[PDB]
Amino acid sequence: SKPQPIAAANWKCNGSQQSLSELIDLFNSTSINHDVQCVVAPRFVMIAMTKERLSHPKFVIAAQNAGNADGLASLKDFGVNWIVLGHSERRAYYGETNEIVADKVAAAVASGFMVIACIGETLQERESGRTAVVVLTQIAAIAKKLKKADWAKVVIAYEPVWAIGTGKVATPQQAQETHALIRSWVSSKIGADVAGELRILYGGSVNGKNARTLYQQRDVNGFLVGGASLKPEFVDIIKATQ
Numbered sequence: 001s002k003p004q005p006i007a008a009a010n011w012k013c014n015g016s017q018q019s020l021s022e023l024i025d026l027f028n029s030t031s032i033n034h035d036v037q038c039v040v041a042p043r044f045v046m047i048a049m050t051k052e053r054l055s056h057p058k059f060v061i062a063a064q065n066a067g068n069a070d071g072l073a074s075l076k077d078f079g080v081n082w083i084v085l086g087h088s089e090r091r092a093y094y095g096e097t098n099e100i101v102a103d104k105v106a107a108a109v110a111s112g113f114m115v116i117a118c119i120g121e122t123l124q125e126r127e128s129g130r131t132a133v134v135v136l137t138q139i140a141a142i143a144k145k146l147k148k149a150d151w152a153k154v155v156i157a158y159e160p161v162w163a164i165g166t167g168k169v170a171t172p173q174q175a176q177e178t179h180a181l182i183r184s185w186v187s188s189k190i191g192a193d194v195a196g197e198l199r200i201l202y203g204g205s206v207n208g209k210n211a212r213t214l215y216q217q218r219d220v221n222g223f224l225v226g227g228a229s230l231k232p233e234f235v236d237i238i239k240a241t242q
Contacts, residue, residue, distance in 0.1 A: 003197050005215075005241035006155060006222035008039040008116060009229030010064065010084060017049060023230070024053045030235055032058050034242045036222070039116070041084050051079065062116070067104060072111045083113050084157075084224070087138070088120030092161045098141035106145040109153045116155045116224065117142060118203065119182075123162040131160075132181055139182055143190060151190065155199045156182060157224040163204020165226060172217050175202045179219035208233030211240035 011020070020042065032038075041062040042050045050061055062082035063075050075083075085104055090096035101117065108115045119138040121131050139156070146154070158178050163170055170178075179200045187195035202214055203224030214220055222241055228234060 002221060003199055004035055004037060006037045006039060006116075006199055006201055007234075007238045007241055008041070008062070008084065008157075008201065008222070008224045009234055010041045010086075010224060010226050011043065011046075011230060012064070012226065013043050014230050015046075017046065019230075020046060020050070021053060023232075023234070024050065026232060026235065027059060028053075028055050030056070030238075032056075032238060036238060036241050038238060039082055039084075041082075047078065047080065066108055066113075068107050072108060072113070076111060076113075081113060082116070083108050084116045084118070086118050086159075088118050088159045088161050089164065092122050098138055101138075102141045102145040105142055105154065106150075109146070109150050112153075114153050114155070116157050116201070118157045118159040118224065120158060120160040120204075121162075126160065126162060131178065135178060135182060136185055139185055140189075143186075148191060148194065151194045151198065155201065157201040157203050158182065159203035159224060161204075165205075167205055169205040169207075169210055169214075170202065172214050172220075175214055176217040176219055179217070183219055206237060208236035208240075211237045215240050215242075 038059045039062050041064050060082055061080055062084050063080050066072055066083045085101055087101040105115050105117050121134040125134045183195050199221040201222045201224050202220055206223045206225045207228045223237055225237055
């Protein structure tokens with residue numbers, strides 16, 4: 001049976017204090033009837049106001065990236081206990097190595113954070129048939145820096161770069177193939193119980209209309225949402241996870 005689903009909002013640099021405060025009031029006033037962990041990641045300079053205003057018991061606040069000693073101590077002091085590491089984008093755009101993100105996941109877990117690590121291929125890798133190789137390389141790099149017990153604090157988000165902000169969502173079939181491959185590797189290499197309890201979320205052009213038929217697939221455990229998370233339809237994406 002599936003582990004607890006997650007619905008995560010990444011606001012990037014978008015929204016004013018007023019527009020974001022309207023979304024928070026909507027979230028606060030929503031009755032959620034099933035078991036789900038909801039996550040909101042505001043820009044750094046909006047973390048304090050979000051902290052003060054967000055009250056729903058099924059919601060936690062996350063930071064948008066954390067590159068060690070430095071900012072981890074600061075975020076921990078401020079009450080923030082989740083981080084979202086956007087590696088598929090940073091790799092594609094700037095050349096960020098797989099070892100860098102692996103080291104960040106390990107350092108965050110050792111400081112007590114829950115971590116959503118975003119892994120994924122480029123348009124060019126997908127078209128050349130290399131999705132499996134690319135994705136398996138990323139998960140393997142992360143695993144090298146972890147011990148078995150650490151996996152309880154890790155969540156994977158499959159976020160192919162061609163689906164981010166483009167309007168081109170993966171089909172339920174494409175998401176299921178990738179999620180199944182990741183889980184299979186984890187079962188063989190790390191352990192069968194670890195694999196069964198791992199959350200694997202899908203991200204890239206998720207919306208209120210397409211979320212339900214993505215969630216039905218065997219190995220999909222929730223969503224990472226960018227553009228549509230700045231809109232009332234985020235509540236529909238939460239409801240799609242049952």
